[PDB]
Design a protein around this ligand. Sequence first.
Ligand SMILES: CC(=O)N[C@@H]1[C@@H](O)[C@H](O[C@@H]2O[C@H](CO)[C@@H](O[C@@H]3O[C@H](CO)[C@@H](O[C@@H]4O[C@H](CO)[C@@H](O)[C@H](O)[C@H]4NC(C)=O)[C@H](O)[C@H]3NC(C)=O)[C@H](O)[C@H]2NC(C)=O)[C@@H](CO)O[C@H]1O
Ligand SMILES: CC(=O)N[C@@H]1[C@@H](O)[C@H](O[C@@H]2O[C@H](CO)[C@@H](O[C@@H]3O[C@H](CO)[C@@H](O[C@@H]4O[C@H](CO)[C@@H](O)[C@H](O)[C@H]4NC(C)=O)[C@H](O)[C@H]3NC(C)=O)[C@H](O)[C@H]2NC(C)=O)[C@@H](CO)O[C@H]1O
Ligand SMILES: CC(=O)N[C@@H]1[C@@H](O)[C@H](O[C@@H]2O[C@H](CO)[C@@H](O[C@@H]3O[C@H](CO)[C@@H](O[C@@H]4O[C@H](CO)[C@@H](O)[C@H](O)[C@H]4NC(C)=O)[C@H](O)[C@H]3NC(C)=O)[C@H](O)[C@H]2NC(C)=O)[C@@H](CO)O[C@H]1O
Ligand SMILES: CC(=O)N[C@@H]1[C@@H](O)[C@H](O[C@@H]2O[C@H](CO)[C@@H](O[C@@H]3O[C@H](CO)[C@@H](O[C@@H]4O[C@H](CO)[C@@H](O)[C@H](O)[C@H]4NC(C)=O)[C@H](O)[C@H]3NC(C)=O)[C@H](O)[C@H]2NC(C)=O)[C@@H](CO)O[C@H]1O
Ligand SMILES: CC(=O)N[C@@H]1[C@@H](O)[C@H](O[C@@H]2O[C@H](CO)[C@@H](O[C@@H]3O[C@H](CO)[C@@H](O)[C@H](O)[C@H]3NC(C)=O)[C@H](O)[C@H]2NC(C)=O)[C@@H](CO)O[C@H]1O
Ligand SMILES: CC(=O)N[C@@H]1[C@@H](O)[C@H](O[C@@H]2O[C@H](CO)[C@@H](O[C@@H]3O[C@H](CO)[C@@H](O)[C@H](O)[C@H]3NC(C)=O)[C@H](O)[C@H]2NC(C)=O)[C@@H](CO)O[C@H]1O
Ligand SMILES: CC(=O)N[C@@H]1[C@@H](O)[C@H](O[C@@H]2O[C@H](CO)[C@@H](O[C@@H]3O[C@H](CO)[C@@H](O)[C@H](O)[C@H]3NC(C)=O)[C@H](O)[C@H]2NC(C)=O)[C@@H](CO)O[C@H]1O
Ligand SMILES: CC(=O)N[C@@H]1[C@@H](O)[C@H](O[C@@H]2O[C@H](CO)[C@@H](O[C@@H]3O[C@H](CO)[C@@H](O)[C@H](O)[C@H]3NC(C)=O)[C@H](O)[C@H]2NC(C)=O)[C@@H](CO)O[C@H]1O
Ligand SMILES: *[C@@H]1O[C@H](CO)[C@@H](O)[C@H](O)[C@H]1NC(C)=O
Ligand SMILES: *[C@@H]1O[C@H](CO)[C@@H](O)[C@H](O)[C@H]1NC(C)=O
Ligand SMILES: *[C@@H]1O[C@H](CO)[C@@H](O)[C@H](O)[C@H]1NC(C)=O
Ligand SMILES: *[C@@H]1O[C@H](CO)[C@@H](O)[C@H](O)[C@H]1NC(C)=O
Lengths: 362, 362, 362, 362
Amino acid sequence: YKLVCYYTSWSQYREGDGSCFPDALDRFLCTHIIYSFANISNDHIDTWEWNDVTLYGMLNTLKNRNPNLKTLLSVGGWNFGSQRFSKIASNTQSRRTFIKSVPPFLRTHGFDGLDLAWLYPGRRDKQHFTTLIKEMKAEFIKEAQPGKKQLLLSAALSAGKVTIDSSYDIAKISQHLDFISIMTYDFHGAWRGTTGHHSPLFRGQEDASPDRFSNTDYAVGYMLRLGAPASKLVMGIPTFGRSFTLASSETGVGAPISGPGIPGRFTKEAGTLAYYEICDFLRGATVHRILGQQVPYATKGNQWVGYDDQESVKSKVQYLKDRQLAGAMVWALDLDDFQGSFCGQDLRFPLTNAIKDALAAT
Amino acid sequence: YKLVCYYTSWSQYREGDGSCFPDALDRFLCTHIIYSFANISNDHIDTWEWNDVTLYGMLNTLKNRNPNLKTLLSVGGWNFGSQRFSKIASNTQSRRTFIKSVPPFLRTHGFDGLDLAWLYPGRRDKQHFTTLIKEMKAEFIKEAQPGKKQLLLSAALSAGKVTIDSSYDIAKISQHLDFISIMTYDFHGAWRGTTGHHSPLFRGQEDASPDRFSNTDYAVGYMLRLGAPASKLVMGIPTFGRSFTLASSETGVGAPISGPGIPGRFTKEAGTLAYYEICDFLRGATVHRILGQQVPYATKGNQWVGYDDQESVKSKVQYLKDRQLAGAMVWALDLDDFQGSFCGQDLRFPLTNAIKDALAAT
Amino acid sequence: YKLVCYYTSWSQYREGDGSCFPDALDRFLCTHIIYSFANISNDHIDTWEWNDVTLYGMLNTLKNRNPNLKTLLSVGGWNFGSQRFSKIASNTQSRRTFIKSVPPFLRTHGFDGLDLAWLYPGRRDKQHFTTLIKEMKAEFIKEAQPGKKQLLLSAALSAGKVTIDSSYDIAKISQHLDFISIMTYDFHGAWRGTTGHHSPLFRGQEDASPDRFSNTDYAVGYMLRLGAPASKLVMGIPTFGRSFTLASSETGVGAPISGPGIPGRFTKEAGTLAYYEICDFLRGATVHRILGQQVPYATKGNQWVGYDDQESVKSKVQYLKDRQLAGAMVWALDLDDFQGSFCGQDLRFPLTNAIKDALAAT
Amino acid sequence: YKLVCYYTSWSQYREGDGSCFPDALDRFLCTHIIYSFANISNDHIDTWEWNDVTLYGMLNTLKNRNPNLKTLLSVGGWNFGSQRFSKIASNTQSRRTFIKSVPPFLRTHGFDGLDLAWLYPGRRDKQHFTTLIKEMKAEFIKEAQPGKKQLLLSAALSAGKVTIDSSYDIAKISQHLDFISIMTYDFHGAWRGTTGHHSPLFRGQEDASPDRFSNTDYAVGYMLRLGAPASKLVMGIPTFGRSFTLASSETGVGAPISGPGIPGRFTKEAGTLAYYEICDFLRGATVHRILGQQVPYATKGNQWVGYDDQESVKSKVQYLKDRQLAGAMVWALDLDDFQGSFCGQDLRFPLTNAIKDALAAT
Ligand SMILES: CC(=O)N[C@@H]1[C@@H](O)[C@H](O[C@@H]2O[C@H](CO)[C@@H](O[C@@H]3O[C@H](CO)[C@@H](O[C@@H]4O[C@H](CO)[C@@H](O)[C@H](O)[C@H]4NC(C)=O)[C@H](O)[C@H]3NC(C)=O)[C@H](O)[C@H]2NC(C)=O)[C@@H](CO)O[C@H]1O
Ligand SMILES: CC(=O)N[C@@H]1[C@@H](O)[C@H](O[C@@H]2O[C@H](CO)[C@@H](O[C@@H]3O[C@H](CO)[C@@H](O[C@@H]4O[C@H](CO)[C@@H](O)[C@H](O)[C@H]4NC(C)=O)[C@H](O)[C@H]3NC(C)=O)[C@H](O)[C@H]2NC(C)=O)[C@@H](CO)O[C@H]1O
Ligand SMILES: CC(=O)N[C@@H]1[C@@H](O)[C@H](O[C@@H]2O[C@H](CO)[C@@H](O[C@@H]3O[C@H](CO)[C@@H](O[C@@H]4O[C@H](CO)[C@@H](O)[C@H](O)[C@H]4NC(C)=O)[C@H](O)[C@H]3NC(C)=O)[C@H](O)[C@H]2NC(C)=O)[C@@H](CO)O[C@H]1O
Ligand SMILES: CC(=O)N[C@@H]1[C@@H](O)[C@H](O[C@@H]2O[C@H](CO)[C@@H](O[C@@H]3O[C@H](CO)[C@@H](O[C@@H]4O[C@H](CO)[C@@H](O)[C@H](O)[C@H]4NC(C)=O)[C@H](O)[C@H]3NC(C)=O)[C@H](O)[C@H]2NC(C)=O)[C@@H](CO)O[C@H]1O
Ligand SMILES: CC(=O)N[C@@H]1[C@@H](O)[C@H](O[C@@H]2O[C@H](CO)[C@@H](O[C@@H]3O[C@H](CO)[C@@H](O)[C@H](O)[C@H]3NC(C)=O)[C@H](O)[C@H]2NC(C)=O)[C@@H](CO)O[C@H]1O
Ligand SMILES: CC(=O)N[C@@H]1[C@@H](O)[C@H](O[C@@H]2O[C@H](CO)[C@@H](O[C@@H]3O[C@H](CO)[C@@H](O)[C@H](O)[C@H]3NC(C)=O)[C@H](O)[C@H]2NC(C)=O)[C@@H](CO)O[C@H]1O
Ligand SMILES: CC(=O)N[C@@H]1[C@@H](O)[C@H](O[C@@H]2O[C@H](CO)[C@@H](O[C@@H]3O[C@H](CO)[C@@H](O)[C@H](O)[C@H]3NC(C)=O)[C@H](O)[C@H]2NC(C)=O)[C@@H](CO)O[C@H]1O
Ligand SMILES: CC(=O)N[C@@H]1[C@@H](O)[C@H](O[C@@H]2O[C@H](CO)[C@@H](O[C@@H]3O[C@H](CO)[C@@H](O)[C@H](O)[C@H]3NC(C)=O)[C@H](O)[C@H]2NC(C)=O)[C@@H](CO)O[C@H]1O
Ligand SMILES: *[C@@H]1O[C@H](CO)[C@@H](O)[C@H](O)[C@H]1NC(C)=O
Ligand SMILES: *[C@@H]1O[C@H](CO)[C@@H](O)[C@H](O)[C@H]1NC(C)=O
Ligand SMILES: *[C@@H]1O[C@H](CO)[C@@H](O)[C@H](O)[C@H]1NC(C)=O
Ligand SMILES: *[C@@H]1O[C@H](CO)[C@@H](O)[C@H](O)[C@H]1NC(C)=O
């Protein structure tokens, strides 16, 4: 089973124990470690952080004691911007320039492939997106013909029905992508006005959630139906939780909230909490395993965080193995308890190690 | 909470360890023990089995050490005959004789009330089935008026949506009934040619499911939605399992079957298995928990059986308490392991007890 | 058969033949004419437009040469505030003030009753909405007891399942209201990115529709199913259409759009078109009757509009009669071709009259 | 567009004007005519009727004036039996003989190809079927490699979901079939106990029919999504109706029935009525266009029949062209008023010619 893992280039700028660099990663932990993100400056694939070229190294050095580890540089990401990408892909001009720059840059940097993280193609870029991947793959071949090891091409697609529909021609692109990562998380926003787990495995109580398709099972399922093969499907699994600030003494699912949740001391970003920050939170908190959804949420004071733990990621892995999917995708190494400290026990990458073990065992 | 348990009056004619009598029941176990079924002969409520009077005897004795235990006589039942019931429902005189015959018959025999087990009113009986309940309650009130402890009136209702829409006016009946037991089991017929748990808590995997309403959760929310007060809703929980005979090596949910499972040694009814027989079956068997449904199934050789155990009833109880229901109803005590034997430890009524415990434990 | 027609107070300000005043309405056309909308200022039901008092009189005049026309004052409306209305229903004191102020304001200004257009009660206002409807009917009773002709109480409910599920306890409110108007229209938002009739009668082609509940039939049947007396259900039918702007040369249902259609010279609101404006659009347009849904749509150049016409409303009246519903509701009189010029024959209210005629014949 | 029309071999043994012979068929009517059915005296496709070999000619003579019509011989039918086919195709040896024995038979009898009517393949026949069609086409090429015009190979398949899943590898079988006639009719059995059109276009009113997939629209789309190519999909249209015998004064859709309708004069088979018997029945009868399904049901006295008229088959034709299908299929040429006397006009094949005109017109 393929175990895809992300690393963000911005997890370095975090206070004390929170800062994370490519060298803090377990060489043997994943089958694919993806660097994110990569910018596109002048229809070309450029670095992002000033030291991205150093870090690109710190990461590839992990291949040294483990030649099985593969790596991909992800281009795009939430920030980049939907429009920027849109243009660079619409005309054939910039599109060829870009496709062109990719192969060498990756080569001259120790990367085993490319990860397309366009978020997301308007309904107007669906045909384009298809081409962009068709051609980009055509190119990846034109380079490896000299006898090299061909560069891997993947994409992080949305898991929400609407988008999946108004942006992807799964049946087609599924052919050129070496594997797909369905980002099955970020399903219940603070705008809804109620508490909701952002990454539930199943729908759960039929009338406790607005629609039937804001969960992992539906997404995974829906996409298989649209033609995506199982062998090219990696199921995303967040190692972060989405929080809210309650507005009443009520604390169950669908309870009233008044905004996202207070910012973690390290990731500092209302609505988010890294697993290691959740671990602190837990002390004195009250955990509730949501029945039909197979995931846990914790509450304490006026805070409510829906997340995943070892038990839930394990459930989640058993789920994918069943559907006999390509494997799990994590987001992101730097959000799990990579130190090994916070969640105690001294062992590190708990949620990802749970995912790792569950994948290899029946 | 209410813990309504059913006791079938034919569980006596069961070979050796199978045979079950009113006296073999834990008088402290339930809050209401319903005896079933009673016939309606000559538009008069009347006994069924040659020795019912003796059994109404053994059962009602259980109220001695435990004065809080209530008992009711259930009239109707699956084999009774859907037609025969309507006949009495729509005859202005048939109904009247019937209603008038109950109060005396109950006081004469020791019951605290009646329970309507009409399966199932037709689309044409929706109204007759509402009048019935309405007048019967009147008769219970008229008889009690002097200063007596009023006779209890309940109805066991279908969990099948189609049935609920064609046969009931939940809205109205709900007010004249003391409680409503919703038969939330028997959801997956063998005629589908595929294995399926007959009593899932939730729908489970979105596509592996037949429809959208063959699971406890839907059934409850629908009835609550339709008007039945939570305080009057009893959630049906089966202590028997639904078996299928496999047709291949596939053993998962949806596997192909060639017919109902093999009859039990004691229940002798293809497609059915008492929990105590499921326990003999479990020896050398493989049990799997169905992820999306919170219920488990077990397979061995060419038999597949979906049933409930301590774990699943606990969740179902957790579920019902969350929904703030009136309690759980069990069908039936003579299908739970009542000798205590069959499942080790030799403790009696594992299922009901597990339910009892979970009902008063938070 | 009841024929409830809405008259908006803002259609008075439209340019040219668009300006619509109460005295421009056919006094024999409808059975009930609801004036909309009225504000609630300082917990008191009040006028909205500076000259509401003048217009109320122009409307109520119509009752003269015809003493069977009933009129109502609709309070609420889309532009009112799901929140403002909530704080008045939640506060026990505010609720009384309001309820108390209605009978006088109603008798004073010459109205037959009230119409509640709270769009829409939150997940948390379900019971408050019921209480609010309960107590207001309790007042219209008290005020009429001396011997007066009881003030009428109605409500314009959502046709959308999600909304209906989180705000309406149909069973209960349905017994206090005199009739319910189900707004069966506004079903395919332009956000979907695709063309789609906003008021289909049935789902039509299965895989060409977004969901199973966005159509009249489902809504009508869902409410009936939920306990609303057909005798009290008024099926809304729209005299306006919802436009879009095509992004390609594709013009059938499901074609990609780039946003709402161009605004009309008179209604001047993107994505909306009154019928009389549609009659203008049809000049050199191409009308197609969507088969599975019984409703038309027209397209010309890059505009696409899904509306209702005489043939389609007739089908709709047929559908409601087979269903045995209290009648039809029309939103709005001023969006129909009230002048009678645009749509030919110089006959006025072509759509509404078609509705009336169809109701009258069997 | 193709136009496959079947001919029954038993359409001769019928009284008076009800006798149908190959020489009675309009040679410029269909583009294909499938003689049905043909037996197999154990691994060798042997005729069925004593004069079968005489009729094969009568049909074929129709090629003399219209050299551009083709004929296939259909082997199977409803009576051939489920087991006979399975047992004959399951035996690797038994098969070969059959496959090998088909071509020479057709070639010697003027038939241009085969048609497979296996009703139906259980779960234990899915692959066999796939193979049978596979190897079957293989042989057709071999025999035709000299320079001869190749033999066609079509298949009549169930339009019912459950049947399709449990037995059709649409993805594969479709690459070998020159075309697929989807038997989109026979949805409502008399076992249901209520009236219902056996061949609706769309499901119509949501709570007036059991499931979402017992109509033409669903079946087709379902098939298309399963891999069936619109270019290789012929949609069946029935030229007969399905009668029921009413049990009360209710005559609408879903009114109670007490068995199938009285046998037709000429077809002499309960629950069935050919169009010519229907046209007759229609005198003094009342027709009703079922609103959501685009189909008529007529009722007179205690009889109820749902069927297709010119108006409705034309709608279904517009439907398939919208779905860009291979064409329409009919059943059967001897059920349509081939006489031209029953439906008056003195014109022949009223429905099929309506189907034809409609196919080439827009
Ligand atoms: C069900 C549905 O469709 N709902 C919509 C939501 O999907 C959507 O939310 C956005 O969802 C995307 C993925 O679907 C998400 O981005 C991916 O996931 C991670 C984690 O959120 C992102 O990581 C962030 O990266 C940025 C830099 O670009 C950092 O600034 C930020 O700190 C990171 N946050 C975390 C938790 O790590 C990645 O960018 C991306 N991963 C990959 C491989 O592409 C967006 O973050 C979601 N939006 C946010 C910020 O909440 C939502 C949009 O608001 O709309 C719903 O309708
Ligand atoms: C979703 C849906 O619509 N499901 C339909 C099923 O409801 C229906 O199957 C019948 O379901 C009812 C419960 O609603 C069931 O009867 C009740 O439940 C128990 C459990 O079966 C019955 O026990 C049997 O009693 C008879 C005598 O009355 C005995 O002969 C038999 O041995 C008993 N079996 C067991 C396991 O104990 C009770 O009769 C009754 N209990 C109460 C409280 O009233 C029927 O038995 C189910 N039918 C059968 C025989 O399977 C199904 C129609 O068959 O249709 C589904 O769609
Ligand atoms: C299936 C589903 O749930 N869809 C949701 C939509 O229903 C919802 O859109 C809003 O829907 C309500 C009724 O369903 C509608 O309000 C009523 O309908 C009329 C006609 O649209 C409204 O008329 C408008 O009134 C405002 C001021 O009140 C005017 O400014 C405007 O010009 C009027 N438009 C027209 C064409 O006349 C009335 O307000 C009201 N009438 C009654 C009987 O109460 C809202 O207007 C709809 N909102 C909009 C902007 O369309 C939608 C909202 O987000 O969400 C969907 O999911
Ligand atoms: C949802 C679903 O799948 N529904 C099931 C039904 O399919 C099934 O009913 C049988 O359906 C098949 C079609 O799929 C039907 O046979 C075809 O259709 C015609 C007319 O139905 C048949 O014609 C008859 O043939 C027999 C002998 O072959 C003659 O004796 C008789 O005179 C003929 N009658 C007519 C109308 O001409 C054909 O045999 C066949 N056509 C082709 C090209 O293959 C069966 O007749 C249907 N069975 C009946 C008679 O009801 C049903 C089984 O009970 O189950 C549903 O669920
Ligand atoms: C806007 C963005 O890309 N994200 C921000 C980060 O880039 C930023 O990191 C800091 O970047 C600057 C360069 O832009 C680093 O400064 C460099 O420091 C080295 C020290 O050896 C020196 O040789 C360079 O001259 C100097 N760069 C220049 C030319 O200015 C700085 O070290 C980075 N931060 C640190 C201390 O690691 C951080 C803020 O620091 O914010 C991100 O949002
Ligand atoms: C169809 C039905 O009601 N259920 C069946 C049971 O009735 C049946 O049980 C036996 O029924 C007979 C007849 O009612 C019983 O006979 C009576 O036995 C007593 C014993 O003291 C005797 O005094 C009576 O004279 C005698 N009466 C009759 C009518 O003959 C018999 O005791 C019952 N035996 C059992 C098992 O208790 C069983 C047969 O095993 O099958 C049920 O399906
Ligand atoms: C926001 C709103 O209520 N809708 C807008 C309308 O109010 C507006 O109508 C105009 O409103 C003004 C203010 O009420 C009217 O002025 C009044 O004119 C009469 C004339 O006899 C005079 O007696 C009043 O004193 C005066 N009111 C005061 C105190 O200012 C004005 O006549 C209205 N215009 C007309 C003729 O319709 C319209 C204008 O476009 O827009 C609505 O959106
Ligand atoms: C079992 C079967 O094939 N289905 C039955 C039909 O065969 C049957 O039709 C009649 O079949 C007989 C043959 O069995 C025909 O008789 C033939 O008549 C000709 C006259 O020229 C004579 O030369 C033949 O020798 C003779 N057959 C023999 C060898 O005995 C008879 O004409 C057929 N009837 C018709 C209408 O043509 C029908 C009804 O009889 O029932 C089917 O079940
Ligand atoms: C990415 O490229 C854009 C376009 O040239 C540029 O404006 C931006 O600075 C680049 N991103 C960063 C911050 O390196
Ligand atoms: C039930 O009563 C009816 C008389 O109304 C009778 O026909 C039937 O045999 C009785 N069944 C039993 C076993 O008592
Ligand atoms: C409606 O009443 C509210 C509160 O009294 C007020 O703020 C608002 O301006 C009023 N609207 C109009 C136009 O009367
Ligand atoms: C072949 O068809 C004939 C009809 O003439 C039938 O009687 C026979 O049973 C079929 N197969 C055999 C050889 O039995």
